[PDB]
Design a protein around this ligand. Structure first.
Ligand SMILES: Nc1ncnc2c1ncn2[C@@H]1O[C@H](COP(=O)(O)OP(=O)(O)NP(=O)(O)O)[C@@H](O)[C@H]1O
Ligand SMILES: Nc1ncnc2c1ncn2[C@@H]1O[C@H](COP(=O)(O)OP(=O)(O)NP(=O)(O)O)[C@@H](O)[C@H]1O
Ligand SMILES: O=P(O)(O)OC[C@H]1O[C@](O)(CO)[C@@H](O)[C@@H]1O
Ligand SMILES: O=P(O)(O)OC[C@H]1O[C@](O)(CO)[C@@H](O)[C@@H]1O
Ligand SMILES: [Mg+2]
Ligand SMILES: [Mg+2]
Lengths: 317, 317
């Protein structure tokens, strides 16, 4: 395991830079040469592959985004396209590949390991959505959670001033974790998530049962995986007429400097990925599970919602 | 379990308000009357005990500190003094007591349970220092970690401008967790903690072996449990003369709005404490361990440093 490559694929997330840093430093510490692949799988294809020295990851651990960049490469689904990428790594004598990203990125890495005997692949879970198996938490989630919190905490100031109900849309793709953890953390009176049957008539009645008791407004936190905030506002108005506004938090959720949890998680997983390559492993995604650093086969991973937590937020509301 | 009291004792920490909120709301949801004890054990003694309604914990989940206040009461070590506090709770028919704080606060709660048959006690771990058994993480730790990170990230800006080494003192009492997690998260070149033998000559030589290689300054993160930053600076200057400044981060570490991790942890533990009282439990401290909510006897608790993590930060440096 003398040469390894590292790349970032799928939606960027805070902490990806830390992960890349840990991969680069852990490799160099073990006398392993390391190449940055730029623009995710697209760079694999376009041969945008460049050696990285210690200094290439200076001033990165605190920075949001990915300095390696990420771009979609749907053509990577074609085995013949992969042959070009595979050759581009074998040209340089690369024996291992660390892929930082999500489910799609992992499938890329599985294919690389299946289709080239001389390359081992290890996946590192990078997404704000928390929607990746093999880990309780993905790199980005803690940062995005906090970002949502800070935004809604500011929305609550204006909601209180005007007794104004806000219907807020969170990211998450098909996962409700962001909406749930954030809704709890801001005392949201309703949390709408794809994992729980969504009862618009019931949410209406709950709000109305709140006005009578003297609560003049609420926060509805809506995971985009369930419906848009504007659709939630539309459907609610059938049952009830409250003075309300829609906020869509948007891409702000993907940015910012990573939190301590993300920097530590990224660093651990970045280091572990290199160690796994050194040990001859392949076709696994790393993660933290019940507070232990683990590695799971992409199979198992491809083959988590906390109903208890959801119930707690509802009882506290 | 018809009446419960809740109090905050020891050094305040971000998330204590969330914990109190969860205790109050979970109690009221279960038709349990709840009394706030103010100024920790001192209020138990001075009879500063007042019923809390749903609204008493409105606008609290995002706020730092403890709205119940905390004050030291060393006299609580005297069994005869405790008799007064015990009577003050029995006067009102209180059958359970939730104590939010640290090791000292727990010992208070153990004594209450030992010395009054009709009162059950449950401890909730609130401290930024992370130094409480029965839990991987205490309420406050994540927030304090992030606070340290944000401060040092700003110090790095000025350190870089001037090629100036900073020797930074973190809180933690006798625990190095804050220093370790934060040192990792900021790429600190040296982390000084009480759990690891401290080699001032070795730290010197490491910095000097850095100047020759072209690194012009560093960050030394010093847990106060090991030594003061000023003592570190003193002892270093024996072996080396670098252009440097001392920062002591101080009480800023105890404040601020809690992070998502702290709000969720506090809420879970606050809710669980009430459930445990309802189930007839006593003389336990709650916590999260390997990502499960658990309860441990004060015995076991009174009877955690991650050497692996410390080694990783050193390899990444
Ligand atoms: N089934 C597949 N087989 C081979 N390559 C794939 C496959 N799915 C995805 N990829 C590659 O992985 C890249 C990233 O996948 P994509 O779905 O964009 O993001 P992801 O890693 O799941 N993270 P997210 O942004 O959260 O969806 C795609 O552009 C493809 O290059
Ligand atoms: N051994 C003991 N027996 C009875 N009561 C105690 C005991 N130790 C402490 N207490 C009570 O607990 C209070 C708080 O303890 P203290 O040492 O201030 O903080 P702590 O809860 O350990 N958290 P920290 O601020 O991190 O040290 C003290 O003022 C006493 O009222
Ligand atoms: O960045 P794009 O292409 O707009 O995609 C939006 C999606 O990406 C994510 O931000 C991260 O996967 C999701 O939460 C969201 O649904
Ligand atoms: O708040 P005081 O009394 O100055 O005590 C300082 C101590 O309290 C803590 O802030 C919390 O226990 C420690 O980290 C620190 O050593
Ligand atoms: Mg995808
Ligand atoms: Mg103490």
């Amino acid at each position: 395991m003398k040469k390894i490559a590292v790349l970032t694929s799928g939606g960027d997330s805070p902490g990806m830079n830390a992960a890349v840093r840990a991969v680069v430093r852990t490799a160099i510490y073990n006398e392993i040469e390391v190449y940055g692949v730029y623009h995710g799988y697209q760079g694999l294809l376009n041969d945008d592959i460049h050696k990285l020295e210690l200094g290439s990851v200076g001033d990165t651990i605190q920075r949001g985004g990915t300095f390696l960049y990420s771009a979609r490469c749907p053509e990577f689904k074609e085995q013949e396209v992969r042959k070009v990428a595979i050759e581009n790594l074998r040209k340089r004598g690369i024996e291992g590949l660390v892929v930082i990203g999500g489910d799609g990125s992992y499938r890329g890495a599985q294919r690389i390991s299946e289709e080239c005997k001389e390359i081992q692949t290890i996946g590192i879970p990078g997404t704000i959505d928390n929607d990746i198996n093999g880990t309780d938490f993905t790199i980005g989630f803690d940062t995005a959670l906090n970002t949502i919190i800070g935004l809604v905490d500011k929305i609550r100031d204006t909601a209180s001033s005007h007794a104004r109900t806000f219907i807020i849309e969170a990211m998450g793709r098909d996962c409700g974790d962001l909406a749930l953890w954030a809704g709890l953390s801001v005392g949201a009176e309703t949390i709408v998530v794809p994992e729980v049957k969504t009862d618009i008539k019931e949410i209406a009645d709950k709000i109305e049962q709140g006005i009578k008791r003297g609560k003049k407004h609420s926060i509805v936190l809506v995971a985009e995986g369930c419906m848009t905030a504007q659709d939630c506002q539309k459907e609610l108005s059938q049952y009830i007429n409250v003075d309300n506004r829609v906020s869509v938090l948007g891409h702000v959720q993907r940015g910012g400097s990573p939190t301590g949890a993300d920097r530590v998680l990224a660093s651990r997983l970045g280091g572990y990925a290199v160690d796994l390559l050194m040990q001859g492993e392949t076709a696994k995604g790393v993660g933290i599970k019940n507070n232990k650093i683990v590695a799971t086969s992409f199979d198992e991973i491809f083959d988590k919602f906390d109903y208890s937590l959801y119930e707690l937020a509802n009882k506290l509301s």
